[PDB]
Design an enzyme around this catalytic site. Sequence first.
Site, mmCIF file in Angstrom:
data_model
loop_
_atom_site.group_PDB
_atom_site.id
_atom_site.type_symbol
_atom_site.label_atom_id
_atom_site.label_comp_id
_atom_site.label_asym_id
_atom_site.label_seq_id
_atom_site.Cartn_x
_atom_site.Cartn_y
_atom_site.Cartn_z
ATOM 1 N N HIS A 11 -10.776 -1.077 -1.541
ATOM 2 C CA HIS A 11 -9.791 -2.045 -0.950
ATOM 3 C C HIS A 11 -8.723 -2.497 -1.933
ATOM 4 O O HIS A 11 -7.621 -2.935 -1.520
ATOM 5 C CB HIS A 11 -10.422 -3.283 -0.199
ATOM 6 N N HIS A 31 -8.026 -9.204 -8.851
ATOM 7 C CA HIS A 31 -7.585 -7.974 -8.185
ATOM 8 C C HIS A 31 -6.205 -8.224 -7.624
ATOM 9 O O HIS A 31 -5.684 -9.319 -7.720
ATOM 10 C CB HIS A 31 -8.557 -7.610 -7.056
ATOM 11 N N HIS A 71 -3.124 -7.209 -4.398
ATOM 12 C CA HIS A 71 -2.685 -6.646 -3.132
ATOM 13 C C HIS A 71 -1.216 -6.223 -3.313
ATOM 14 O O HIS A 71 -0.463 -6.930 -3.983
ATOM 15 C CB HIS A 71 -2.777 -7.695 -2.028
ATOM 16 N N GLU A 73 0.173 -11.277 0.270
ATOM 17 C CA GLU A 73 -0.586 -11.820 1.403
ATOM 18 C C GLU A 73 0.027 -13.146 1.829
ATOM 19 O O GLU A 73 0.490 -13.282 2.949
ATOM 20 C CB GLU A 73 -2.059 -11.892 1.023
ATOM 21 N N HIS A 131 -4.872 -12.100 -7.346
ATOM 22 C CA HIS A 131 -5.901 -13.104 -7.019
ATOM 23 C C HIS A 131 -6.925 -13.173 -8.129
ATOM 24 O O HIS A 131 -7.578 -12.158 -8.413
ATOM 25 C CB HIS A 131 -6.579 -12.742 -5.716
ATOM 26 N N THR A 179 -9.484 -13.257 2.188
ATOM 27 C CA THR A 179 -8.508 -12.456 2.946
ATOM 28 C C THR A 179 -9.012 -11.059 3.232
ATOM 29 O O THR A 179 -8.299 -10.280 3.859
ATOM 30 C CB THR A 179 -7.143 -12.366 2.246
HETATM 31 N N1 LIG Z 1 -8.616 -11.397 -1.287
HETATM 32 S S1 LIG Z 1 -9.747 -12.515 -1.663
HETATM 33 O O1 LIG Z 1 -9.768 -13.567 -0.642
HETATM 34 O O2 LIG Z 1 -9.639 -12.955 -3.084
HETATM 35 C C1 LIG Z 1 -11.324 -11.635 -1.466
HETATM 36 C C2 LIG Z 1 -11.643 -10.796 -2.699
HETATM 37 C C3 LIG Z 1 -12.896 -9.955 -2.482
HETATM 38 C C4 LIG Z 1 -14.238 -10.660 -2.766
HETATM 39 B B1 LIG Z 1 -14.387 -12.343 -2.951
HETATM 40 B B2 LIG Z 1 -15.871 -12.564 -3.937
HETATM 41 B B3 LIG Z 1 -17.264 -11.897 -2.993
HETATM 42 B B4 LIG Z 1 -15.975 -12.740 -2.146
HETATM 43 B B5 LIG Z 1 -16.655 -11.256 -1.461
HETATM 44 B B6 LIG Z 1 -17.028 -10.100 -2.783
HETATM 45 B B7 LIG Z 1 -16.527 -10.913 -4.249
HETATM 46 B B8 LIG Z 1 -14.765 -11.217 -4.305
HETATM 47 B B9 LIG Z 1 -15.432 -9.687 -3.570
HETATM 48 C C5 LIG Z 1 -15.614 -10.046 -1.865
HETATM 49 C C6 LIG Z 1 -15.317 -8.885 -0.913
HETATM 50 C C7 LIG Z 1 -16.525 -8.195 -0.264
HETATM 51 C C8 LIG Z 1 -15.920 -7.062 0.570
HETATM 52 S S2 LIG Z 1 -17.278 -6.247 1.582
HETATM 53 N N2 LIG Z 1 -17.730 -7.533 2.630
HETATM 54 O O3 LIG Z 1 -18.437 -6.128 0.599
HETATM 55 O O4 LIG Z 1 -16.806 -5.191 2.205
HETATM 56 B B10 LIG Z 1 -14.858 -11.535 -1.426
HETATM 57 ZN ZN LIG Z 2 -7.317 -10.887 -2.715
#
Ligand SMILES: [N]S(=O)(=O)[C][C][C]C1234B567B89%10B%11%12%13B85%14B%1158B%12%11%15B9%13%12B%1061B%12%112C5%153([C][C][C]S([N])(=O)=O)B%14784
Ligand SMILES: [Zn+2]
Length: 257
Positions: free
Chosen positions: A61, A91, A93, A103, A116, A195
């Site tokens: 992603h 990371h 976007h 975003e 972010h 997001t």
């Molecule tokens: N764009 S953002 O709002 O900063 C989201 C960033 C991505 C994530 B944050 B923190 B935890 B949560 B969740 B894990 B980690 B970091 B990584 C995540 C994704 C799992 C994507 S999946 N559900 O595994 O496909 B979110």
């Molecule tokens: Zn993000």
Amino acid sequence: HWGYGKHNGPEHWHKDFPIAKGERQSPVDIDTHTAKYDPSLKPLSVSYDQATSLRILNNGHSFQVTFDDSQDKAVLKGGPLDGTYRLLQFHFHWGSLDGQGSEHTVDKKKYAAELHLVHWNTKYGDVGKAVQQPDGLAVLGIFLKVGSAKPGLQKVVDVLDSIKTEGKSADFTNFDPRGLLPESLDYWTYPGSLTTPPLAECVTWIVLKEPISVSSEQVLKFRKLNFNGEGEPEELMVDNWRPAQPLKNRQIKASFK
Ligand SMILES: [N]S(=O)(=O)[C][C][C]C1234B567B89%10B%11%12%13B85%14B%1158B%12%11%15B9%13%12B%1061B%12%112C5%153([C][C][C]S([N])(=O)=O)B%14784
Ligand SMILES: [Zn+2]
């Protein structure tokens, strides 16, 4: 599985993640004239001197730089926050062209990219627990415009050829995220969500007013990444941004006049 394409992109996510149509979804358009200056908002405290970067990863992603979050080494405090939030990863976007990629938008303006820095609230002990809480995460968002190069980004850019496809990672030690920050920590803040899936409503958003400038050569390297795994048809990792979502019953507050 979810992505950013026609058949699996943001307009489809609500089928697997119904909170996608919730009351506090992100990103949003920041209407600068409607945001209210809040003189009670504190300056943001960014304490990144002891940060320990570990790895760089193409996660299908975006790409992410992950940090040691087992101690209070790189933390966000103050601003709209109560308590201490540990840096887990950063990371980006970005777009297929410089006129899209962010975003958040500012008076409908899209930036070429958005950084972010994801932090979680130490009172919840781990990120998995934090995502289940309305004040679990604080994400510091920084806009990228295209112009002059950002010297502190170059170490990141230069290793992306080694993580082209989903699942690839590399050692990425001694990276200093202070080199990605603009001069000013003036910000907007609002309660929102992740997001990306799972789109959990767990984020205090802190979006800096001042963009950083990056070069065209730097952003072009982002655009050489692939959404696909090695051996699958090549699909450039571009336009990995969720569009602005309805503000609903929320106020965006500004730290500055
Ligand atoms: N764009 S953002 O709002 O900063 C989201 C960033 C991505 C994530 B944050 B923190 B935890 B949560 B969740 B894990 B980690 B970091 B990584 C995540 C994704 C799992 C994507 S999946 N559900 O595994 O496909 B979110
Ligand atoms: Zn993000």
